[PDB]
Nucleic acid binder design. Structure first.
Lengths: 188, 342, 117, 342
RNA sequence: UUAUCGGCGAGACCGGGAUGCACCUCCCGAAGGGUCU
DNA sequence: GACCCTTCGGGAGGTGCATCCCGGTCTCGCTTGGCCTCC
DNA sequence: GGAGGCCAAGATCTCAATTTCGTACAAGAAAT
């Protein structure tokens, strides 16, 4: 339906009504501070500090390694005109350029399957096999397409807590390209 | 000097259309939308105001009367002042301190200009927008296609000499080859109209220059057509108009209306009721209306208005109710002291 | 210069149809609707106006008459102006100076263009 | 003394528009914006406050009494001080800072000046801006285009003498030639204004001069048009207005309002309801509104305000429901101790 | 946080003029038929 | 009492005109004596 | 008739200048 009537309030009582409801997530925070970042949970379900058992973030310190490369301000604007969903060609050229400069298997998380299709079109498949998530496809088929031959996997949407891990279990994509932050459309 | 509110409904006996330049676009004739793109269209109060202003101008022209040949004593500048509020002679100063009390005189001598103001003089009449009551009371009308007369009807060929039939032959071949050429350059022009969309600003303007030179190429290809500069067979783009029987709420006001000015307004409404045409598309008989207005007055400080009467305009006649509207009309008709040479 | 209102009814002796290019779609031939999908369809005034204009053009060519071979004195341009309303030689401009007060005389000389414009 | 908050909605009967010098630019007419180009336009509280202040000034003029043949017993200084708070005389008693009970005697003797303030005297009335409810609800109304009356319908030309016909001929030829020349000059001018975007500060001086000189060239070209200084036929730039039926949330406050001052304010709303017009473009009947206000008073130190009643202004009347609103109106109407003179 | 303390305020209607309109036939072709107390 | 078989192609404009102008405030961030009332 | 209480003058001057957020995907049901 929607949360237009604050339907959330309802489910909040539900968590109260049980003995104890444990809401966890890898992304249950906006900031690294519990009480500043979980306030969207404190404000959407209606559960408040008094009734909140705990508000905490547990992050490991030594878990994995990570090199970050980010596009700066000067980088070409992603959308020449966002309303009618046109992607500026300069940004497409830059994105394909950086995609082709990768020397190993990579996971490209675009935001829309439309972005998946435009990026696949603009790519010349100069790199090892490019695997594309068709609009409304199933990710796991491309996952098992990718385990047999690791390469470049452009899969918008997807994720939902999934990972293209190998058979025994190993990081088979040293690079992960988030082309654009998946900014949600404006919803009048 | 009382305020009169004509609150009422316009029912469209024929579709009611207008093409206002800002509202219309590359798509085609479209009514102004009352807001955003998808908002309910309205008939402009500007068009209604212009129609009623010209009706009042003709009322005044008849009231002063014509000479034997039928010309009016008013000068061209007087006509333009009366029905458009423009001084062609350019003697209308905006905020000159010597017109501060030019108002009451110019009003009582020129009830028309007082009603419909000028550049510097506030119009006493405010003619509002006609807003439809229901939804889906508009639609695309006038959809058609001009077709060659001699292809639809074969008899007209026997009305043409041999050389004229050969001219029709040349004109048809000319339309055919010139149109396929125009179509080829058109599909190229819209191919790169689709191509500019994902273009940086420099290449954006470069593709817009390419579009304008393919437009000049369109024009040049048209020029080369010696038989006709334009095609003769073509689909006519439809125009957006209010449906027949659409009910449009209308609100007109005469602020501080004296008897003579209100009477002139009612005479204008009657003369418009002689030809109740609003908007344009005179072909297809678009614009014919049957409008009824409830005239209400509101003495300042009173908590309620008083309904002076009703003005029903129907194809079968004009009905005026209430003694007050009749009194205003008679007062205007019996006031001989109007000097419209303002 | 009197305004004539022809208010009346057309009774349909045989089914009355028209293929308006807007109204038709890939769904099928549909009469032009009086606003929206579900409104009451109308017969366009454009079709009636064209039929009456061609009728008036035939009236005028019949009143002017035909030569022995049966060819009207008018040319292709005059026929198109009279019934089709399109200028073959480009002698038609809007809001041009010079045609001010020539419209009345042209209307008196050419009642067809006067009526149907 | 009570603090009255009128919280309520202004529904729009005809589009609500206003031209503020700040908001509008060369790009066109724009409504005053709620802090940004891509912001919801608001109807300024300045226009509403001025309309209500003039309504209250008319209330006072009526309440004292129109003697003579309708001349009010007030000088021009008094009318300006009551309606705009400007003292032309300079004799208004300027309250030097630190004066205890600054203007308390003036407030008691002039409820209107107390309500709407003056220079050095705080106005108890604060008329807030009218913020629209919901996205859209604004649009580019008005618009259209001036057309030559005699090029639209030929019947009016039977009312023009021969000399006036040749005058119209000359006027139109002049309009065409001036249009072509001015349009070429304007093409040069807009190319120059495109060269602004290459904004080198040292060039900007030479470009402002080279564009203001070309605008003086435009003015001189227009000045040599013997028949008409301005082109009669021209598209009207549309004005931005809140659409008909738009809901604009309005908040008005009277701080420390006596029953006399609040009664004066309610009487001002009553008289405003006679001509409930806000803004401009009143030729197109723009500004006609129906507004309903909930009057809530708040005793300081009380956690909740109490509702005194509701003021509904509608085309069918003014519904002031509430014992305290009627008490305020009767008290204002029954207090004979107001001195509005110098 | 190199101390302590300080509402910046009061008034203004931006409004006044405009018909966007003028021309077009969308038509051209067809059997929906045959079977059974 | 079971299917048939779903048509093409036209052709898609031309212009005109884009205003005039107002009119942009007071203050005041300190102390002192002179003069005027007046407890 | 000395205490308020309002009002006018004191000569000089620092300095500085603007053009538009965010554009989607899933997976998964004993149903409102």
């Amino acid at each position: 339906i929607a949360v237009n009537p604050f339907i959330g309030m309802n489910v909040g009582r539900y968590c109260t009504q049980w003995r104890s409801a444990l809401l966890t997530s890898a992304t249950l925070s906006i900031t690294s501070t519990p009480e500043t970042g979980m306030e969207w949970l404190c404000k959407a379900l209606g559960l408040t500090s008094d009734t909140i058992s705990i508000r905490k973030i547990f992050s490991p310190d030594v878990y994995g390694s990570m090199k970050l490369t980010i596009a700066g301000a000067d980088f070409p604007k992603v959308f020449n005109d966002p309303k009618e969903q046109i992607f500026s060609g300069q940004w497409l050229k830059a994105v394909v350029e950086q995609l082709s400069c990768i020397q190993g298997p990579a996971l490209v998380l675009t935001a829309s399957h439309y972005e998946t299709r435009m990026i696949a079109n603009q790519l010349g498949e100069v790199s090892q096999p490019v695997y594309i998530q068709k609009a409304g496809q199933a990710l796991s088929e491309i996952i098992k397409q990718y385990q047999e031959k690791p390469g470049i996997l452009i899969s918008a949407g997807a994720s939902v807590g999934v990972s293209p891990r190998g058979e025994n279990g190993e990081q088979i994509f040293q690079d992960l390209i988030i082309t654009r932050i998946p900014f949600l459309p404006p919803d009048r | 000097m009382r305020t009169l509110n004509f609150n009422g409904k316009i029912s469209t006996l024929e579709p009611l259309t207008v093409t206002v330049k800002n509202a219309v676009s590359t798509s085609g004739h479209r009514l102004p939308r009352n807001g955003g793109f998808n908002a309910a269209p309205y008939f402009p109060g500007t068009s209604i105001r212009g129609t009623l202003r010209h009706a009042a101008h003709k009322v005044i022209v008849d009231r002063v009367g014509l000479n034997a040949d039928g010309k009016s004593p008013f000068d061209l500048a007087e006509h333009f002042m009366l029905a458009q509020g423009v001084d062609i002679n350019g003697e209308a100063e905006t905020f000159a301190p010597g017109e501060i009390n030019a108002g009451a005189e110019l009003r009582s001598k020129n009830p028309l200009i007082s009603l419909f103001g000028r550049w510097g003089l506030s119009g006493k009449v405010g003619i509002g927008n006609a807003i439809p009551d229901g939804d889906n009371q508009w639609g695309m009308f006038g959809g058609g296609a001009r077709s060659i007369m001699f292809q639809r009807d074969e008899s007209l060929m026997e009305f043409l000499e041999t050389d004229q039939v050969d001219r029709l032959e040349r004109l048809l071949e000319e339309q055919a080859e010139a149109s396929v050429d125009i179509s080829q350059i058109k599909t190229e022009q819209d191919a790169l109209k689709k191509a500019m969309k994902s273009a940086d600003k420099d290449t954006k303007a470069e593709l817009q220059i390419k579009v304008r030179e393919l437009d000049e190429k369109i024009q040049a290809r048209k020029d080369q057509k010696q038989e006709s500069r334009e095609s003769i067979r073509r689909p006519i783009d439809p125009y957006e108009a209010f449906i027949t029987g659409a009910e449009l709420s209308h609100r007109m006001s005469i602020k501080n209306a004296t008897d003579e000015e209100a009477g002139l307004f009612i005479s204008a409404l009657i003369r418009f009721a002689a030809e109740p045409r609003f908007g344009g598309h005179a072909n297809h008989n678009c614009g014919l209306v049957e409008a009824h207005w409830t005239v209400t007055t509101w003495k300042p400080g009173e908590l309620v208005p008083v309904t002076l009467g009703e003005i029903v305009i129907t194809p079968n006649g004009v009905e005026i109710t209430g003694d007050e509207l009749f009194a205003m009309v008679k007062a205007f008709n019996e006031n001989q002291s109007f000097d419209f040479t303002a």
